[PDB]
Design a protein around this ligand. Sequence first.
Ligand code: NA
Ligand code: NA
Lengths: 330, 328
Amino acid sequence: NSSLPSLRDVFANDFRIGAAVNPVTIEMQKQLLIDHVNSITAENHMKFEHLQPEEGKFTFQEADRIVDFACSHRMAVRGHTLVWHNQTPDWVFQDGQGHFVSRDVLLERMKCHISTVVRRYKGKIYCWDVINEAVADEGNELLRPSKWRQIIGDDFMEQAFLYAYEADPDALLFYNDYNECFPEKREKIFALVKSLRDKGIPIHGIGMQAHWSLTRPSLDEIRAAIERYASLGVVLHITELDVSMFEFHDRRTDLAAPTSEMIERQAERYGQIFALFKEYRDVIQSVTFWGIADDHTWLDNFPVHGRKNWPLLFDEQHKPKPAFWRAVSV
Amino acid sequence: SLPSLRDVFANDFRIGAAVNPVTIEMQKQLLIDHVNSITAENHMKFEHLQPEEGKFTFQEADRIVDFACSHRMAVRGHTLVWHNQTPDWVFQDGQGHFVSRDVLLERMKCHISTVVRRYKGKIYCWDVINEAVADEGNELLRPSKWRQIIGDDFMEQAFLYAYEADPDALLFYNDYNECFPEKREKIFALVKSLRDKGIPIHGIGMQAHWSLTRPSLDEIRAAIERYASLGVVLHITELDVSMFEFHDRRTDLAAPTSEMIERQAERYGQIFALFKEYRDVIQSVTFWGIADDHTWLDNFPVHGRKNWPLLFDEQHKPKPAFWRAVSV
Ligand code: NA
Ligand code: NA
């Protein structure tokens, strides 16, 4: 590593380079993070259930440790995430009686959470994934079902963005989602963000999660999605990048190591992706990987529990993989 | 489908490889995919072209030239007059005594004329004189039989014979350790002297048999500048980056270490950035091979010790060095 290029430095004129972390991986992967990144996202500890597990019980200790680490290494922080259909406790939607709460009560609870969390980190966190994954990932409807949407109505997203803007009007506010380059879902995401900007809602950016495979989305699909979203005038962040060794249909559990062909194709794929991101450096301002090295990745247990995946630029011993050298040489 | 080296550097310089007929077959697709210049590693040296007086054995050189010409590759001719790889007959009479100056010039002229005329129109440049400057000491030139018999104008004569045989060729002085300041100044003085005398010497060949740390980038830049100030063409003729420092004769390693691989990558990125910077004065960069399955450094200076000096590995895959070189 002594003579290795530093990712944040190679890309200094193009975009920030980020990693998702938690307090345990900050300790386990500390030197890689120090050597390579200039942005951090909490993998889990700024989600609703990890910040307000019971009403009026806020548990900021883990998030605080992550922000302290970033600020002491001059790293930016992306806040992830305020309003999502997952990892939100049931209390949020329920009354004492158990029944679903009203629209007005859920809006009050949404405003209080957003206000308390965003004001705590104002001046340290420069952007927030305000809405995560509201667009349908299947079928013909625009929006996924969720209790937020069921109880408030379809303007729940408008309200979330307005509450976050009031809490920190200097933050950049994002709509964040995955499968963002598949054309049908891209058109839904575009339509949604267009309609919010067309009402004056303070949505400043689109977060492209980029939970990609070796084959999907194609490079033409990524190009088309970057152009489509940039044409709205928003900022783009690539927010959760990883390149899975398995396609969505491949649910094998038996592989104890990637083949040479997988390792070589992943290297080619990461070179191709970074060349494209560099080509769109005027609209992409940050690329965050959902991790930093193959000793920790959510893809070990998703979408198949208990297997192993090798999705990042560094291996389990924190050494650069063939993908690293192609990524940094674009 | 990787970037092609000749394409990456199309606006900067040719990209070459040393070959022989066995490595053209073993590395054929890498050559076709990457280079636009070829040098014969061995088979255009005097002992491989005229092993006995009047016996010319062009078959292997012809095969290398045919390959190049069939793939739109230039050819650098290597080498006409050198103290190495020249048969004993050249300097001897029938009674085994050394021949006179005039007989050796006749032999030098006959060899150069026959060899250069055969490839005229196909080979665009020649390393006419190889490695004439000394290692150490204050003496400018190393002793050699060529120099002993003819006198110090042997180089002047070789260049005039080569020019006569093909006035359209670029004629080079080629040498190694070309960026060490003491040797650099001798090479400068020698070429300057020939040039000012009107000798048709057009180019300096910088062999660039380098290590991970020597010469320094500052040494390489000074040498490029010093030689370019002569007004000659510059070719990097025999580039390789040894995983061992020259005096390191260690034999214990079966594979490059991660540190070796990563330092070599940084080194090759530094060197190509510098070459690119000096694109105005450098017109070709040839490596002394193309992939680590064949390299003279596997047996020099330690016989049978493997080295890993080039941009592609033994399986013809790009190394970290490839990616940093093309990144510049
Ligand atoms: Na940018
Ligand atoms: Na040039």
